[PDB]
Design a protein around this nucleic acid. Structure first.
Lengths: 48, 89, 1137, 49
DNA sequence: CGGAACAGTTGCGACTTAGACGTGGTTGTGGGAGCTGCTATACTCTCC
RNA sequence: CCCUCGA
C-alpha cells in the first residue's frame, strides 16, 4: 500500500527491523546529551 | 519518519515548547523569595491564598476545606494578597 | 587566445593545436530543448537550417495528436491549433521576491464544429500561466530558482540479451520490446529449452501460443520457424492449439478472475499493442526497430506502432540468435546482423531533455482535459455550447505544477558560484521516473563506456553513492532531435585532415575510424606518423594505419566537461584527483573581491559568460551612465538599454551574488562584451580563488597530513574573506489557545535587549546581531495549567489580567553573527497571500563577513585539499630573500603518492607568470622554445596565460622559461632554474638549509567552514516520539552514539560510561533531569533509570499482537509506571504547605 | 519433523494456536505515531495512522 | 487579623441565525501507472 | 524518507 509518490508505507514490522529500525537505531545506539562535534586540525604542540 | 526539523518547527508555535532537562531541573528548584514571603503570612492567610491563587478553589469549596464562613475566606484572601503585594515587589 | 569575445583579457595560450570549431553555447542543451517546446522562431530557423520535416513544436505536436476531439457518436468535434504565448506576468526578480512562478499565459485557437448543422465556432481559449524558462535556462517556481536535469533513459526499441550465467553453464538468450508508452513484451528461451513470453510481467507461455492467438495456424509457424529445432520442440510442449483457445488462454493470463470473450479479447489484444491509444512506440522506437530488424528500407514515416511482422521479426531474430547465426534476412527486409545489444551504449541510451519532460506532462494533463471535454459533450445543449464551456484548464496547470513540485528531475538549483550552476544545467542524470532505481543500479551502469567519448565527461561525477549515476555533457556535445548525443569530427579524406565538420552519433561513430586530437599533423593534412592510436570498433584502442582514417577529433578537451576543462595540466593528474578537482571547483565560495588565475586553461572566460551570472551587452553602443545600481548603453540607433545590477543577493546556498560594473562612462562596448562582473568572475573570466604564494615543505608539524598553513596576511587583507547571507523566517499562526502575535511586548524581557527592535517588534535594519539576540518578537497563547505555581501566585496578587503567553520570538542560532541587511513582512491585515491559519510572515536577512580561519577547507584544481591547521603571524612565515613572506605552506609528503603532479607544474608556471620572463633570442631561438608561439617568447610580470588540457605547456618549455625568469625590483632572481628558492625561518631567522620549491598556486575557499560545523550541546530539545535528543546543529541536537561506538565501549569494557550514554544522557527521563539537578548542586551523579526506548519497544511489540512481559524473579510481571505524586509533593513543599 | 517443531511448540500449556487469528487489532499510543502541523498549513502523519 | 452586608465580573446556559457541508439521486460512453537495469545464498513449496 | 553533498 503506497502513499503519495508511490512510496510504500512503513508497517509495524518496519519499525523493528532494518538498519533504521528500533533495535539498531534507537536501542543499540542513541543520540546523547553533553556532546559536540567539529572539524579537526593537527595538534603538534600537544602532549599525547 | 517525522523529521527532527519538523518537530522543532512545530514546537516554535506550541503552547509549551521543547524543554531541555536543564529547564525542567531549574523550574523544579524551590523559589526562595516566594517561599520566605509566604512564610511571613499568617497560616490562615497562607492556606487561603494558596488554595485560591494556586489550586483555584472557589470561595465555597475553600470555606468547606477550611471550616470557616465564606466571609472569612474573602477577608483572608484580600488581606493576605495585599500583604504579599507589600512583601514582594 | 580567446579572441572571438570583444574586450576579453589577453591570455596567451601554450596550445600548439588549432581548434577549427568554436565551443557551442553551453546552455543550448537547456534553451534548445525549451525553444522546441514553445516552437520559438529561433527553433524554426534552426529547424529550416537542419531541413524542415514541416517542423512542429512540442506544444503543437501535443495539440495535433489530440485533435480532433470527437463525440462518441461522431456528432461534434473540437480541434486546437496555433498556440500563442502572451507577455510574461512578472519579471524574474519580482517572482523571486513575491514567491511567484515565472510564467506566461498560453492561448490556443479552439474550433468547434457541429457535424449536423455545419455551424462552426472558432474561439480563443486561455490554457493557463505557462512556467517559462529564463534567459539563464532555469525556472522560478514559487519564487525559488530551479533546474530540470536531462534524464538518461533507454530509448524505445528491441534489445537482445545473452546470459551464460545459468547454472547449467549453458547460454540463454532474452529480448525486451520497450515502447515509449505502452505494455512490455518479453521473449525468453528457457534454460529448459522453451521459448517463453511475458506480457507486463505476466508468466511465460510458449511463443507459439501468442502467435497462434494472432491468427496463426500450427502449420504456418512450422513454415517460417521450422528451421529452429527449439521452436519444433516448443510447439509440441504447447498445450493447446487453435486461435480461440489461444486468445482465451491469453485473456485468462491478463485478468485473474474475469470471464473471457472472443470479441472482447481480440479487441483487447488489439488495443493492448496494435492500437495507438494504449500503446505508443515513438518515432525513435520505430526507426530503432526498423534499423534493428531491417524491416522498412524505403523509410516510411507513416505510423509508429508494433506490427505482426514486428512480432514475427522479433521471434525470428531471437530464434537465429540462440542458434548462433550471425545474420538474418526477413521477407521484405535486408541483411541485419544478429547480435546482442549493449544496454549502456549511447546509441541505445537516450537523453530526455527538459522540453520533452515538460511535453510529457503537458500530454498527461491535456489528455485529462480531453476526458473532461468528452464528458461535457454529452451533457450540454448544442448551440448552448462554446468551446470555453467545454474546456476546463485546471488539470493542465495542475499537471505542470505537480511536475516542478514533485519530480526528482526538477531540482533546487545549486548556485554556490556560476560554475556549480552551469554544470547543474548540463547534468545527465540516470535516476528518476522512467530511469532506474538506485537499488537496481549495478556496477555496470556506473562505468565509463566507450560510447561516452566526446559525449559524457568520464571525469566529472560524484564520488559518493551517486558515482556513475550523474554525469556532465562534454564541451562540444549536442542533443540531436531524437535524444541521442552527437559530437563533431573532422573529415579525413585520403590521409589528409580537412576542415569539414560532421556531427556523428554513437552508432555512426562505430562504422568509422576516429583519430585522437593528440595525433600530430603538419601544415599539410598528412599525418606525421604511419601508425596512429585510434578508436575503431566498439571502443578498442589500436595502433592503426593512417592510410585508413575516417574522422578526427576537433580538439582536445572534446571528451571533457566544462569544469574538467578548467584544470591546468590535467593530463598530469590521475583520474581520481582530477575528479576531486572538478567537483571541488563547484564548492568554492565567492570572495569579497575576485582574482583571475595567472594559470588558466582558457575555458574560464567562455564559462563565465555562458553561465550567465555576468552581465553582457546585447547590442554595441556607448556607456551613457554608470553607477553601482545600473548600467545604461546608448546604441548607435539612438535607442538605449539599461542593465540593473544584482547587489548583495542571497543564493540558494547562502553565498553572495554581487555584480559590479567593469565599464566606465563614455566607454565604447561591443555586442557580447562583458559589462559587469559576477560573483566569481574577474574581467569576465571565472575566478574561483586567489593566487597565493606557496612553499612546499614540512613546517613544524602544522601542515602534517594534508593540513594547510596560512599567512595571516590572507586574514588581514581579506583575500580569502567571503560574504554569507542567511534567511531567517518566522510567522504568527493560529493555535489551540488562540492566535500568535508578532509584538515588541515580550514578557519579563529587559528593555536593553529589545533596544534594536522597531515598533512592530522586528529588528531594525543595520543592527549587529549575535546569537540569542531577538530578530522578531512573537508571543504564543499559553494555557492556565502551564503556569508554575509561583508564576500563578504573582499574577493573581498583582492583578495582572494580561493574556498568559510564552515567548516564541525568533532568535539568532548559536554560532552566528552579522548585520541585518533586509526585512520582508507579509500581513493578513493587508492583501498579502498567506497559507491557511497564518496571520503574519516576517523574513530577516543577516549578512556575515567570514574571514578565513582554522578549520576552513581549501583546495586546488588538482584534487589537493586540506583544512587550515594553523594561521601564523606574517612574521614567522618563511620568507624569500627580498622579505616577501609566503602565503601558504603545503606539505611535501602529500603530493607524490596522490599522482597529481599538475599542482607542481602549475606552481612552476605560476611563478613565471608572476615575475614575467624574456627568453634569450640573441643567438637565435633556443631548441626548447622552438615550438612556443612568438607571443610567449616574453611576458611582463603578472602575465595571465592559458595551458589548455591535453595541449599544454610542455615539460621542456616550462623548464626553459624557469631560466629566463625576470628579476625583482632589486635585480635579484629569487627562484632558480629548478623552481626553488632559499627561504628564511621567520621564527629563528636562520635560513632553511636547502632550497624549497616555491611559486604561485590557485587556491579556493571551499564551502565547508568551521562556523557552519562547530556544534556543542549540554542539554536541549528531545524528540516527543522516542524521547531521545534531536539531531542536527540547526535543532541544537546531540551526537549519535551508534552501534559501532557501543562496540568500542564494550571492547574497552567500560560499563558505566556506556550505560550513562544510553540512559541519563539520552533516554531516561527522570535521570536526565536528576543528573542536571545534581551537577548544579555539586552532588554525585544519580543511578540511571530505565531508558524510554525500551518501554517504546515493548509497546510496538504489543501492537504486533506479541504479549511481552518483564518478569521478576518471582515469576510475576512488572508494571512500568511512575508515581505521579512525587512531583506534586515537591512543588507543594516548595511553597511551604 | 519440521511440522512437529510447530505442533510440539503449541503443545505446552498457556499457549494456544487460536492467537494466530485475531478478532481484535491493538492500537499503538498516539505519541508513538504522532501528527505535526507544518509550515504552509499542512500536516504530516506517521504512515501508521 | 473574623462573620455578615453589599456591590462589580466572569461564565455557564439558552436561543437565533448564515453558511459550510454533506447529502439525494445518480441511466448514450467509460479497464492504472509503472516497470523490471541489482547480486548472492538458503530453503520451503510445488509441479512432476 | 527522498534529493544532493563531506570524511
Amino acid at each position: 500500500v503506497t502513499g503519495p509518490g508511490n512510496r510504500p508505507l512503513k508497517s509495524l514490522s518496519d519499525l523493528l527491523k532494518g538498519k533504521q529500525g528500533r533495535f539498531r537505531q534507537n536501542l543499540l545506539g542513541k543520540r546523547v546529551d553533553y556532546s559536540g562535534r567539529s572539524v579537526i586540525v593537527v595538534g603538534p604542540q600537544l602532549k599525547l | 519518519q517525522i523529521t527532527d526539523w519538523q518537530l522543532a518547527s512545530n514546537a516554535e508555535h506550541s503552547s509549551t515548547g521543547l524543554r531541555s532537562a536543564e529547564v525542567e531541573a531549574l523550574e523544579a528548584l524551590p523559589d526562595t523569595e516566594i517561599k520566605e514571603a509566604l512564610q511571613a503570612l499568617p497560616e490562615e492567610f497562607r492556606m487561603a491564598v494558596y488554595y485560591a491563587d494556586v489550586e483555584g478553589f472557589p470561595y465555597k469549596e475553600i470555606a468547606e476545606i477550611m471550616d470557616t464562613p465564606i466571609g472569612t475566606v474573602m477577608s483572608r484572601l484580600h488581606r493576605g494578597r495585599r500583604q504579599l503585594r507589600g512583601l514582594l515587589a | 587566445s580567446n579572441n572571438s569575445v570583444p574586450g576579453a583579457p589577453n591570455r596567451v595560450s601554450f596550445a600548439k593545436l588549432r581548434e577549427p570549431l568554436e565551443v557551442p553555447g553551453l546552455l543550448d542543451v537547456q534553451t534548445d530543448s525549451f525553444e522546441w517546446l514553445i516552437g520559438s522562431p529561433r527553433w524554426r530557423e534552426s529547424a529550416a537550417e537542419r531541413g524542415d520535416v514541416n517542423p512542429v513544436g512540442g506544444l503543437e505536436e501535443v495539440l495535433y495528436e489530440l485533435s480532433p476531439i470527437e463525440d462518441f457518436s461522431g456528432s461534434m468535434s473540437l480541434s486546437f491549433s496555433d498556440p500563442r504565448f502572451d507577455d510574461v506576468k512578472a519579471p524574474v526578480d519580482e517572482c523571486k521576491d513575491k514567491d511567484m512562478t515565472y510564467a506566461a499565459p498560453l492561448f490556443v485557437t479552439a474550433e468547434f464544429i457541429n457535424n449536423n448543422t455545419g455551424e462552426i465556432k472558432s474561439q480563443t481559449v486561455f490554457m493557463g500561466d505557462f512556467p517559462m524558462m529564463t534567459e539563464k535556462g532555469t525556472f522560478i517556481i514559487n519564487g525559488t530558482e530551479r533546474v530540470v536535469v536531462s534524464q538518461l533513459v533507454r530509448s524505445p526499441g528491441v534489445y537482445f540479451d545473452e546470459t551464460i550465467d545459468k547454472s547449467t553453464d549453458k547460454t540463454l538468450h532474452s529480448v525486451k520490446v520497450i515502447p515509449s508508452r505502452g505494455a512490455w513484451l518479453e521473449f525468453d528461451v528457457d534454460k529448459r529449452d522453451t521459448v517463453g513470453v511475458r506480457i507486463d510481467r505476466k508468466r511465460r507461455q510458449p511463443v507459439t501460443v501468442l502467435l497462434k492467438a494472432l491468427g496463426w495456424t500450427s502449420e504456418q509457424i512450422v513454415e517460417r520457424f521450422g528451421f529452429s529445432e527449439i521452436m519444433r520442440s516448443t510447439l509440441e510442449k504447447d498445450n493447446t492449439v487453435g486461435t480461440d483457445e489461444a486468445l482465451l488462454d491469453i485473456y485468462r493470463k491478463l485478468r485473474p478472475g474475469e470471464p473471457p470473450t472472443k470479441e472482447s479479447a481480440q479487441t483487447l489484444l488489439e488495443n493492448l499493442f496494435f492500437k495507438e491509444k494504449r500503446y505508443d512506440l515513438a518515432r525513435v522506437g520505430r526507426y530503432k526497430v526498423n534499423k534493428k530488424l531491417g524491416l522498412h528500407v524505403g523509410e516510411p514515416i507513416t505510423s509508429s506502432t508494433l506490427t505482426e511482422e514486428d512480432v514475427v521479426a522479433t521471434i525470428e531474430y531471437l530464434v537465429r540468435l540462440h542458434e548462433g547465426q550471425t545474420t538474418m534476412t526477413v521477407p521484405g527486409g535486408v541483411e541485419v546482423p544478429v547480435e546482442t545489444d549493449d544496454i549502456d551504449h549511447f546509441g541505445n541510451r537516450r537523453l530526455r531533455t527538459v522540453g520533452e519532460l515538460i511535453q510529457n506532462q503537458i500530454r498527461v494533463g491535456m489528455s485529462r482535459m480531453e476526458r473532461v471535454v468528452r464528458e461535457r459533450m454529452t451533457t450540454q445543449d448544442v448551440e448552448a455550447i462554446t468551446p470555453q464551456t467545454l474546456i476546463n484548464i485546471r488539470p493542465v496547470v495542475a499537471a505542470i505544477k505537480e511536475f516542478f513540485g514533485t519530480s526528482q528531475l526538477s531540482q533546487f538549483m545549486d548556485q554556490n558560484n556560476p560554475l556549480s550552476g552551469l554544470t547543474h544545467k548540463r547534468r545527465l542524470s540516470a535516476l528518476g521516473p522512467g530511469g532506474l532505481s538506485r537499488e537496481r543500479a549495478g556496477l555496470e551502469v556506473r562505468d565509463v563506456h566507450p560510447s561516452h567519448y566526446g559525449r559524457m565527461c568520464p571525469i566529472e561525477t560524484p564520488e559518493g553513492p551517486n558515482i556513475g549515476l550523474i554525469g556532465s555533457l562534454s564541451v562540444y556535445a549536442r542533443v540531436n532531435p531524437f535524444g541521442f548525443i552527437e559530437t563533431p569530427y573532422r573529415k579525413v579524406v585520403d590521409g589528409v585532415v580537412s576542415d569539414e565538420i560532421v556531427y556523428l552519433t554513437a552508432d555512426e561513430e562505430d562504422r568509422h575510424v576516429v583519430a585522437q586530437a593528440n595525433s600530430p599533423i603538419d601544415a599539410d593534412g598528412r599525418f606525421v606518423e604511419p601508425r596512429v592510436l585510434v578508436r575503431r570498433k566498439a571502443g578498442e584502442v589500436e595502433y592503426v594505419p593512417s592510410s585508413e582514417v575516417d574522422y578526427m577529433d576537433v580538439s582536445p578537451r572534446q571528451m571533457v566537461s566544462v569544469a574538467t576543462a578548467m584544470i591546468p595540466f590535467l593530463e598530469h593528474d590521475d583520474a581520481n584527483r582530477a575528479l576531486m578537482g572538478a567537483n571541488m571547483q563547484r564548492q568554492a565560495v565567492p570572495l569579497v573581491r575576485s582574482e583571475a588565475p595567472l594559470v588558466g586553461t582558457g575555458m574560464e572566460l567562455r564559462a563565465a559568460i555562458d553561465a550567465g551570472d555576468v552581465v553582457v551587452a546585447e547590442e554595441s553602443g556607448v556607456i551613457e551612465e554608470v553607477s553601482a545600481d545600473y548600467i545604461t548603453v546608448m546604441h548607435d540607433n539612438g535607442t538605449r538599454r539599461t542593465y540593473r545590477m544584482r547587489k548583495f543577493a542571497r543564493s540558494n546556498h547562502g553565498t553572495c551574488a554581487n555584480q559590479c560594473p567593469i565599464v566606465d562612462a563614455g566607454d565604447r562596448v561591443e555586442a557580447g562584451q562583458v559589462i559587469a562582473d559576477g560573483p566569481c568572475t574577474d574581467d569576465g573570466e571565472m575566478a574561483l580563488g586567489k593566487n597565493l604564494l606557496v612553499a612546499i615543505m614540512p613546517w613544524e608539524g602544522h601542515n602534517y597530513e594534508d593540513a594547510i598553513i596560512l599567512s595571516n596576511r590572507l586574514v588581514e587583507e581579506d583575500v580569502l574573506t567571503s560574504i554569507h547571507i542567511e534567511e531567517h523566517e518566522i510567522d504568527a499562526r493560529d493555535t489551540k489557545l488562540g492566535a500568535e502575535e508578532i509584538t515588541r511586548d515580550i514578557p519579563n524581557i529587559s528593555d536593553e535587549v529589545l533596544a534594536d527592535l522597531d515598533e512592530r517588534g522586528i529588528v531594525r535594519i543595520g543592527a549587529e546581531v549575535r546569537d540569542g539576540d531577538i530578530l522578531v518578537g512573537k508571543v504564543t497563547p499559553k494555557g492556565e495549567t502551564e503556569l508554575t505555581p509561583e508564576e500563578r501566585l504573582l499574577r493573581a496578587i498583582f492583578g495582572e489580567k494580561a493574556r498568559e503567553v510564552r515567548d516564541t520570538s525568533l532568535k539568532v542560532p548559536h554560532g552566528e553573527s552579522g548585520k541585518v541587511i533586509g526585512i520582508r513582512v507579509f500581513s493578513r491585515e493587508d492583501e498579502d497571500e498567506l497559507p491557511a491559519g497564518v496571520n503574519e510572515l516576517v523574513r530577516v536577512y543577516v549578512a556575515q563577513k567570514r574571514k578565513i580561519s582554522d578549520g576552513d577547507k581549501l583546495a586546488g584544481r588538482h584534487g589537493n585539499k586540506g583544512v587550515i591547521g594553523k594561521i601564523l603571524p606574517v612574521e614567522d612565515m618563511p620568507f624569500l630573500a627580498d622579505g616577501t613572506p609566503v602565503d601558504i605552506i603545503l606539505n611535501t609528503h602529500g603530493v607524490p603518492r596522490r599522482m597529481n603532479i599538475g599542482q607542481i607544474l602549475e606552481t612552476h608556471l605560476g611563478w613565471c607568470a608572476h615575475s614575467g620572463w624574456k627568453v634569450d633570442a640573441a643567438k637565435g631561438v633556443p631548441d626548447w622554445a622552438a615550438r612556443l608561439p612568438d607571443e610567449l617568447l616574453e611576458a611582463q610580470p603578472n602575465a595571465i596565460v592559458s595551458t589548455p588540457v591535453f595541449d599544454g605547456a610542455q615539460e621542456a618549455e616550462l623548464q626553459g622559461l624557469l631560466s629566463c625568469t625576470l628579476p625583482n625590483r632589486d635585480g635579484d632572481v629569487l627562484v632558480d632554474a629548478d623552481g626553488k628558492a632559499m627561504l628564511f625561518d621567520g621564527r629563528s631567522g636562520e635560513p632553511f638549509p636547502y632550497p624549497v620549491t616555491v611559486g604561485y598556486m590557485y587556491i579556493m575557499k571551499l564551502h565547508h567552514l568551521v562556523d557552519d560545523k562547530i556544534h556543542a550541546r549540554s542539554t536541549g530539545p528531545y524528540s516527543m516520539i522516542t524521547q531521545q535528543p534531536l539531531g542536527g546543529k540547526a535543532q541544537f541536537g546531540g551526537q549519535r552514539f551508534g552501534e559501532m561506538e557501543c562496540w568500542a565501549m564494550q571492547a574497552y569494557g567500560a560499563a558505566y560510561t556506556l550505560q550513562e550514554l544510553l540512559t541519563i544522557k539520552s533516554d531516561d527521563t527522570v535521570g536526565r533531569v536528576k543528573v542536571y539537578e545534581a551537577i548544579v548542586k555539586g552532588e554525585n551523579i544519580p543511578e540511571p533509570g530505565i531508558p524510554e526506548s525500551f518501554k517504546v519497544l515493548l509497546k510496538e511489540l504489543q501492537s504486533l499482537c506479541l504479549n511481552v512481559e518483564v518478569l521478576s524473579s518471582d515469576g510475576a510481571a512488572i508494571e512500568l509506571r511512575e508515581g505521579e505524586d512525587e512531583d506534586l509533593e515537591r512543588a507543594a513543599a516548595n511553597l511551604g504547605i | 519433523l519440521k511440522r512437529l517443531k510447530v505442533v510440539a511448540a503449541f503443545q505446552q500449556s498457556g499457549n494456544s494456536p487460536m492467537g494466530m487469528v485475531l478478532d481484535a487489532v491493538p492500537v499503538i499510543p498516539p505519541e508513538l505515531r504522532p501528527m505535526v502541523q507544518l509550515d504552509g498549513g499542512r500536516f504530516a502523519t506517521s504512515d501508521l495512522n
